[PDB]
Design an enzyme around this catalytic site. Structure first.
Site, mmCIF file in Angstrom:
data_model
loop_
_atom_site.group_PDB
_atom_site.id
_atom_site.type_symbol
_atom_site.label_atom_id
_atom_site.label_comp_id
_atom_site.label_asym_id
_atom_site.label_seq_id
_atom_site.Cartn_x
_atom_site.Cartn_y
_atom_site.Cartn_z
ATOM 1 N N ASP A 166 0.800 -0.874 0.339
ATOM 2 C CA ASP A 166 -0.161 0.247 0.147
ATOM 3 C C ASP A 166 0.991 1.025 0.610
ATOM 4 O O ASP A 166 2.276 1.163 0.126
ATOM 5 C CB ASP A 166 -0.799 0.630 1.325
ATOM 6 C CG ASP A 166 -2.474 1.050 0.865
ATOM 7 O OD1 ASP A 166 -2.468 0.873 -0.222
ATOM 8 O OD2 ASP A 166 -3.311 0.195 1.891
ATOM 9 N N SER A 167 0.209 1.807 0.034
ATOM 10 C CA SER A 167 1.063 3.660 -0.603
ATOM 11 C C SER A 167 1.661 4.323 0.860
ATOM 12 O O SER A 167 2.376 5.173 0.223
ATOM 13 C CB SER A 167 0.347 4.689 -1.402
ATOM 14 O OG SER A 167 -1.390 4.747 -0.962
ATOM 15 N N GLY A 168 0.708 3.992 1.623
ATOM 16 C CA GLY A 168 0.945 4.675 3.237
ATOM 17 C C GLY A 168 0.204 6.647 3.660
ATOM 18 O O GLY A 168 0.200 6.465 4.330
ATOM 19 N N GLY A 169 -0.008 6.974 2.352
ATOM 20 C CA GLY A 169 -0.067 8.402 2.825
ATOM 21 C C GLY A 169 -1.479 8.477 3.226
ATOM 22 O O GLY A 169 -2.525 8.465 4.528
ATOM 23 N N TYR A 170 -2.622 7.060 2.336
ATOM 24 C CA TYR A 170 -4.051 6.761 2.740
ATOM 25 C C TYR A 170 -4.116 5.956 4.591
ATOM 26 O O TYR A 170 -4.766 6.854 5.340
ATOM 27 C CB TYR A 170 -4.548 6.293 2.453
ATOM 28 C CG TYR A 170 -5.995 5.613 2.818
ATOM 29 C CD1 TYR A 170 -6.735 4.573 4.033
ATOM 30 C CD2 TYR A 170 -7.437 6.169 1.769
ATOM 31 C CE1 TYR A 170 -7.784 4.468 4.179
ATOM 32 C CE2 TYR A 170 -7.742 6.122 2.507
ATOM 33 C CZ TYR A 170 -8.678 5.148 3.646
ATOM 34 O OH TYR A 170 -10.093 5.366 3.807
ATOM 35 N N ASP A 206 -2.382 7.941 -2.699
ATOM 36 C CA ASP A 206 -3.822 8.582 -2.791
ATOM 37 C C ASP A 206 -4.200 9.023 -1.642
ATOM 38 O O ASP A 206 -3.044 8.803 -0.793
ATOM 39 C CB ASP A 206 -4.710 7.288 -2.847
ATOM 40 C CG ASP A 206 -5.136 6.454 -2.255
ATOM 41 O OD1 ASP A 206 -3.914 6.298 -1.144
ATOM 42 O OD2 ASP A 206 -6.220 5.826 -2.608
ATOM 43 N N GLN A 212 -11.714 6.813 -5.920
ATOM 44 C CA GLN A 212 -11.683 7.663 -5.270
ATOM 45 C C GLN A 212 -12.968 8.258 -5.038
ATOM 46 O O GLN A 212 -13.485 8.176 -6.745
ATOM 47 C CB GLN A 212 -10.917 9.206 -4.184
ATOM 48 C CG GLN A 212 -9.486 7.970 -3.837
ATOM 49 C CD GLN A 212 -9.979 7.132 -2.623
ATOM 50 O OE1 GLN A 212 -11.213 7.334 -1.897
ATOM 51 N NE2 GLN A 212 -9.048 6.088 -2.259
ATOM 52 N N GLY A 229 -11.806 3.960 -1.067
ATOM 53 C CA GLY A 229 -12.586 4.997 -0.081
ATOM 54 C C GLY A 229 -13.911 4.356 0.018
ATOM 55 O O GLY A 229 -14.972 5.139 0.901
ATOM 56 N N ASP A 263 -8.103 -7.246 0.770
ATOM 57 C CA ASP A 263 -7.668 -7.645 1.497
ATOM 58 C C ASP A 263 -8.205 -7.004 2.822
ATOM 59 O O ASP A 263 -8.739 -6.256 2.706
ATOM 60 C CB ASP A 263 -5.711 -6.672 1.495
ATOM 61 C CG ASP A 263 -6.423 -5.544 1.790
ATOM 62 O OD1 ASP A 263 -6.753 -4.306 0.839
ATOM 63 O OD2 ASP A 263 -6.248 -4.862 2.902
ATOM 64 N N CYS A 300 -14.025 -27.455 6.917
ATOM 65 C CA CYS A 300 -12.287 -26.926 7.204
ATOM 66 C C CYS A 300 -11.606 -27.965 6.934
ATOM 67 O O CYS A 300 -11.343 -28.717 7.674
ATOM 68 C CB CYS A 300 -12.017 -26.161 7.591
ATOM 69 S SG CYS A 300 -10.785 -24.980 7.404
ATOM 70 N N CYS A 326 -8.176 -27.532 6.954
ATOM 71 C CA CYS A 326 -6.707 -26.886 7.584
ATOM 72 C C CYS A 326 -6.487 -27.817 8.275
ATOM 73 O O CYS A 326 -7.519 -28.535 9.221
ATOM 74 C CB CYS A 326 -7.039 -25.147 8.156
ATOM 75 S SG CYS A 326 -6.774 -24.696 9.761
ATOM 76 N N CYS A 343 -8.125 -28.274 12.011
ATOM 77 C CA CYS A 343 -9.399 -28.587 12.253
ATOM 78 C C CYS A 343 -8.756 -30.499 11.850
ATOM 79 O O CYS A 343 -9.717 -30.957 12.152
ATOM 80 C CB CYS A 343 -9.976 -27.955 10.697
ATOM 81 S SG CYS A 343 -10.986 -25.933 11.224
ATOM 82 N N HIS A 396 -6.029 -20.937 11.117
ATOM 83 C CA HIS A 396 -7.603 -21.574 10.815
ATOM 84 C C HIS A 396 -8.917 -20.032 9.516
ATOM 85 O O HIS A 396 -8.879 -20.718 8.666
ATOM 86 C CB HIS A 396 -8.403 -21.984 11.618
ATOM 87 C CG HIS A 396 -10.004 -22.053 11.032
ATOM 88 N ND1 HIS A 396 -10.742 -23.392 10.529
ATOM 89 C CD2 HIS A 396 -10.718 -20.621 11.541
ATOM 90 C CE1 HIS A 396 -11.985 -22.593 9.802
ATOM 91 N NE2 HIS A 396 -12.422 -21.824 11.175
HETATM 92 N N1 LIG Z 1 -4.046 2.892 -0.536
HETATM 93 C C1 LIG Z 1 -5.623 3.377 -0.047
HETATM 94 N N2 LIG Z 1 -5.631 1.684 1.223
HETATM 95 C C2 LIG Z 1 -6.395 1.852 1.592
HETATM 96 C C3 LIG Z 1 -6.577 0.479 2.792
HETATM 97 C C4 LIG Z 1 -5.618 -0.367 3.161
HETATM 98 N N3 LIG Z 1 -6.275 -1.341 3.516
HETATM 99 C C5 LIG Z 1 -5.964 -2.286 4.482
HETATM 100 C C6 LIG Z 1 -6.730 -3.005 4.989
HETATM 101 O O1 LIG Z 1 -7.854 -2.580 6.006
HETATM 102 C C7 LIG Z 1 -5.758 -0.855 5.348
HETATM 103 C C8 LIG Z 1 -4.984 0.452 4.422
HETATM 104 O O2 LIG Z 1 -2.875 -0.480 4.243
HETATM 105 C C9 LIG Z 1 -8.181 1.123 2.435
HETATM 106 N N4 LIG Z 1 -9.052 1.735 2.194
HETATM 107 C C10 LIG Z 1 -7.583 2.800 1.167
HETATM 108 C C11 LIG Z 1 -7.182 3.676 0.745
HETATM 109 O O3 LIG Z 1 -8.563 4.392 -0.232
HETATM 110 N N5 LIG Z 1 -6.586 4.379 -0.615
HETATM 111 ZN ZN LIG Z 2 -9.862 -25.318 9.834
#
Ligand SMILES: Nc1nc2c([C@@H]3N[C@H](CO)C[C@H]3O)c[nH]c2c(=O)[nH]1
Ligand SMILES: [Zn+2]
Ligand SMILES: Nc1nc2c([C@@H]3N[C@H](CO)C[C@H]3O)c[nH]c2c(=O)[nH]1
Ligand SMILES: [Zn+2]
EC number: 2.4.2.29
Lengths: 362, 362
Positions: B92-96, B135, B182, B209, B259, B297, B299, B302, B328
């Site tokens: 991920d890009s970090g700013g969010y 973003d 967005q 978003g 994710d 399951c 895994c 289990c 699990h």
């Molecule tokens: N750059 C970015 N990242 C995220 C995330 C990522 N998803 C992770 C799990 O919620 C947390 C964060 O790293 C959720 N929404 C956004 C989003 O809109 N932009």
């Molecule tokens: Zn399991």
């Protein structure tokens, strides 16, 4: 598969190496037993414990008798099934820890009432393979008169432990029973205790009441006269010991079995054992160190991950940090035991002990 | 081995299944990415993450850029080597996250200054395989005028992300770059955002978003018009989602990648996912339950351990509890994705979604 068969394959001085065959597996001696506090060796799956080389684990009883409870664990199929370890388990007797962590009478320990008969039944319910006699915890330091009283009660309790064990057919036929020598740091009491235990007769003999703050020099001095008092043809188990150098010195004095929480507990606290001594992986000096925790260690952790990564994990409070440190430390302990066994077998343990100490304390 | 090749093998309605081929491996879609907060998927070795079926993990950048730092991780050989995961990693890009957990300008986010150029360089230094555009985080709720401002800045930042990525040869040749749509919950802004991203051109398109407190009905309503705005021939990534039913509904609306921290985080807190809905393993009703966490399951957890044992571990605060619950839950998520892929492939995903919901919410 024998119930309990101890065979000494080689000697060097007072040191011995060999095997204990039991129904659930073979125990190579000298043996180190990882400690499982509450039906888990902390941060390790049983398969990982086995992968490190462990032949047997110690199950703490004091914790389990409270929750989930021995009757409950038995209803769920026994401790082996419960936690997923199918090899031998030695269970401690519970009273010692209760007093260490109370009101004592001839009947037992009140804290609930724990008697030697109840202790054996609890260990039966857990499905223990090596059952410890129910003994009392002697304070340290202690007067000769005070250590004598505790030791004698422990010896009377040892007889009751023996009788309760023998009265349970399934237990007597499938498990083993170890007596515990007491008597603090006093030679004559250690002798009376040894004599009493031998008169009763046990499958193995533990040296109890040590590593209670007496220091290594004193512990070794006590082992010097205490271990020869025990039957030579039976295993000798030093309870709660210890650091790697404690283990080497204890084997030099005739000890066959060990348990302690140090590799697991200090692993989680960031201490890693190496052949060049312990390191604390949190130290800034490891932040960019790409070497494994130890340069020779054969464990899975040292094959894959760097000091730098583990440093990061422990400083970040990550569970994987605890997992990797613990697996390495337990593996290191097992490689130590393997080196001890091989060197005794080959008649070069004296040299190994010297080489080990020279490098470990360099 | 291709840099980035997305191929759709089968469709059903808006749902798609297929593969993304990358240099470090193949990603089966729809895909779930376990989240690795600080260069670890919490309480799991990478081999265990892989054993559960994961093809790719998400690496959080916000944590790593501080400590150990991106330059340090690069000096140690990159994130893959560092943590021992040799398959694709999306960063991920970090700013969010910074804004979510600040002072914004056209240059970037101050908290230190994080710019889109700096974000790409950080992700380069980590050795990321899928690089996210830098973003901005839109507050929720937000006025149309406010969501428009954020979205437009994000779109300008997306262009700068594209240019910084393209200027780095090693990155452009070996990695992929995803743009992030967005525009909050507003259709016209989602359209402008999609248009802008398409004009720039990306390897994949994320819906950002969402899952910010709008609720599932609203999230689904937004996905209904938002996903068709994205290029059909590129992967669609819904960031930070979600619960199993969120995932199924999102796939029904054209999402290919997911994710979220729920399986790992709620695993440690005692929540286990099952085909009959989530359970909290700490509940007293599980104290003598010998069944596995889930009856079907596949895994490793289990196959071996009971609810009763895991109940005991979590209530005792044992690390192995966190380990087993986490393995699990991640495995359950992967089996969910596998069932989704198979049912789309076979043209029976609609029925699967209905069957899944009927049982999960029963
Ligand atoms: N750059 C970015 N990242 C995220 C995330 C990522 N998803 C992770 C799990 O919620 C947390 C964060 O790293 C959720 N929404 C956004 C989003 O809109 N932009
Ligand atoms: Zn399991
Ligand atoms: N029954 C008993 N147990 C122990 C122990 C056991 N060793 C464990 C590790 O120190 C703790 C406890 O379970 C140390 N000394 C003794 C002892 O003298 N008696
Ligand atoms: Zn190691």
């Amino acid at each position: 598969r024998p119930r309990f068969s101890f065979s000494i394959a080689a000697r060097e001085g007072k040191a011995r190496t060999g095997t204990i065959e039991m129904k659930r597996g073979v125990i190579r001696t000298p043996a180190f037993m990882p400690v499982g506090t509450a039906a888990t060796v902390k941060a390790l799956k049983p398969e990982t414990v086995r992968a490190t080389g462990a032949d047997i684990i110690l199950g703490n009883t004091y914790h389990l008798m409270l929750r989930p409870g021995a009757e409950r664990i038995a209803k769920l199929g026994g401790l082996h099934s419960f936690m997923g370890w199918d090899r031998p388990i030695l269970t401690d007797s519970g009273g010692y820890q209760v007093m260490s962590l109370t009101k004592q009478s001839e009947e037992g320990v009140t804290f609930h009432m724990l008697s030697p008969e109840r202790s054996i039944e609890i260990q039966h319910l857990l499905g223990s393979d090596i059952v410890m006699a129910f003994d009392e915890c002697t304070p340290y330091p202690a007067t000769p008169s005070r250590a004598a009283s505790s030791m004698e009660r422990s010896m009377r309790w040892a007889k009751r432990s023996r009788d309760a064990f023998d009265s349970r057919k399934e237990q007597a036929e499938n498990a083993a029973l170890f007596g515990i020598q007491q008597g603090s740091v006093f030679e004559n009491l250690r002798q009376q205790s040894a004599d009493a235990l031998a008169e009763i007769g046990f499958d193995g003999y533990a040296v109890g009441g040590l590593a209670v703050g007496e220091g290594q020099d004193e512990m070794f001095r006590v082992l010097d006269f205490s271990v020869p008092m025990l039957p030579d043809d039976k295993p000798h188990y030093l309870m709660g010991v210890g650091k790697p150098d404690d283990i080497v010195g204890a084997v030099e004095r005739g000890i066959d079995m060990f348990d302690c929480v140090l590799p697991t507990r200090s692993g989680r606290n960031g201490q890693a054992f190496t052949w060049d001594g312990p390191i604390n992986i949190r130290n800034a000096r490891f932040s960019e160190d790409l070497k494994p925790l130890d340069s020779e260690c054969h464990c899975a952790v040292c094959q894959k991950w760097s000091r730098a990564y583990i440093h990061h994990l422990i400083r970040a409070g990550e569970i994987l940090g605890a997992m990797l440190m613990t697996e390495h430390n337990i593996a290191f302990y097992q490689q130590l035991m393997q080196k001890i066994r091989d060197s005794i077998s080959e008649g070069r343990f004296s040299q190994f002990a010297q080489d080990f100490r020279a490098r470990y304390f360099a």
